[PDB]
Amino acid sequence: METLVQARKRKRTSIENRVRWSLETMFLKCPKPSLQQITHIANQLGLEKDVVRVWFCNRRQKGKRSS
Numbered sequence: 001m002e003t004l005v006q007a008r009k010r011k012r013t014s015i016e017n018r019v020r021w022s023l024e025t026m027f028l029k030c031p032k033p034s035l036q037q038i039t040h041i042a043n044q045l046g047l048e049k050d051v052v053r054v055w056f057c058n059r060r061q062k063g064k065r066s067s
Helices: 017-027 035-045 049-060
Strands: none
């Protein structure tokens, strides 16, 4: 109960499963998200730029170049 080292995916203190896919709808509006918009993305879900970059890495290669 009072432990913080056994999450399921990563964390839920400031990254609800809906917050991550909330980022998704914000990135599927334009294919040109500025790194400045990435700063507003962090303040948008209180996460670290490191988890927002790895999270957008998959959002970048979901199926644009399948071979």
